[PDB]
Amino acid sequence: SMSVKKPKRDDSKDLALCSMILTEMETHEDAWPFLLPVNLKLVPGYKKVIKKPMDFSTIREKLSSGQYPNLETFALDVRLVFDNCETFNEDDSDIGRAGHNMRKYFEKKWTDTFKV
Numbered sequence: 001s002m003s004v005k006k007p008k009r010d011d012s013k014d015l016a017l018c019s020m021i022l023t024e025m026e027t028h029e030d031a032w033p034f035l036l037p038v039n040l041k042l043v044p045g046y047k048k049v050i051k052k053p054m055d056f057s058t059i060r061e062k063l064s065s066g067q068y069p070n071l072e073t074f075a076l077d078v079r080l081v082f083d084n085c086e087t088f089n090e091d092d093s094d095i096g097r098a099g100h101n102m103r104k105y106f107e108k109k110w111t112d113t114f115k116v
């Protein structure tokens with residue numbers, strides 16, 4: 001509270017580290033469904049069904065232009081990518097599987113990088 005300051009982690013490397021993690025995502029072989037925004041004019045249903053579209057290139061742009069206030073807002077967007085994927089794709093599909101794989105991949109890197 002006022003004048004009662006919690007000791008707080010060093011966050012000067014967070015921007016660099018998030019960019020590092022995002023780069024590993026981008027270069028994963030199962031990243032292809034998530035590299036670019038879904039084309040809302042070619043994919044039936046998507047615009048109406050998915051209220052907050054998100055993809056790695058949009059996250060990269062936001063990260064590069066200071067649009068994430070902190071590491072958790074970054075993680076929220078990454079997770080949004082995979083939550084959208086689950087919303088629109090069957091688990092038993094190529095894209096569906098890719099999403100599960102990429103989510104697992106991210107969360108381990110997240111834990112390994114930040115939660116000591």
Ligand SMILES: Nc1ccc2cn[nH]c2c1
Pocket residue numbers: 038043088089095
């Ligand atoms: N087959 C196919 C084509 C476009 C999209 C977008 N999300 N999932 C898709 C699946």
